[PDB]
Amino acid sequence: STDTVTVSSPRAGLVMEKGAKVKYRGIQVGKVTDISYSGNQARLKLAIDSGEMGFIPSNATVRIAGNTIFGAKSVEFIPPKTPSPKPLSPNAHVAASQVQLELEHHH
Amino acid sequence: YFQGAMASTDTVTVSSPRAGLVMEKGAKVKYRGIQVGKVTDISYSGNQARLKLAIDSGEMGFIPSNATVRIAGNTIFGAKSVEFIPPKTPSPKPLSPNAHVAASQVQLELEHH
């Protein structure tokens, strides 16, 4: 059985592999189940063993490893220098060198 | 193959040059301001990132074959694990069953290879 614990994030833009390990002194104790996105704040839903929490004081602290990555939002097609009369065959593919990763502009 | 009844949309795939692309749900596909499709799935293999798409078959007769791909987005934090640290002077009280920890106690380190 598990007890649900929660954590608010310093960065609202936090993505995490659904159901990732939760460690303490090297041993796993639970997993993250859900991630809530209320407004411009992010809060984590944790779930850890119902009896293991006796080994974690209330005033503990948290470390989250990770990387800075690109959170895409949409995908647009762009008309070229000269448009080809041929349309797009199904199952076709566009390589990486034809893809442009962009930042959106904020007022 | 065999014929589809209705609303039969086709697929087109995209290679992301930077492995590490995650994508927001509700990801739609546009072309000159018209929404034409959606994104099915995402996968990773080798050191590359695949993308499968779903575009309405009728709207593909208008997308040129030599069209480039634009992908908007914002840089975000790609978390991997959650760890706990014993405070310098720990509290005798164990963790309450429904405890909350705001951003104050959370620390967001980068990874090492």
Residue numbers in the entry:
A (entry chain A): 39 to 145
B (entry chain B): 32 to 144
What does the paper say about this structure?
The mammalian cell entry genes (mceA–mceF) encode the substrate-binding proteins of the lipid-transporting Mce complexes in mycobacteria. In terms of lipid transport in Mtb, Mce proteins are characterized as ABC transporters. It is now well demonstrated that Mce1 is involved in the transport of mycolic acid/fatty acids and Mce4 imports cholesterol.
Despite extensive trials, only MtMce4A39–140 crystallized readily in several conditions in space group P65. Although Matthews coefficient calculations suggest the presence of 6–8 molecules in the asymmetric unit, assuming a solvent content of about 50%, the solved structure showed that only four molecules are present in the asymmetric unit, corresponding to a solvent content of about 71%. The domain-swapped dimer is formed by the extension of residues 107–141 from one molecule into the other molecule. The residues from 107 to 141 are exchanged between the two monomers to complete the signature MCE fold. Nevertheless, in the crystals the MCE fold is still conserved despite its domain-swapped dimer conformation.
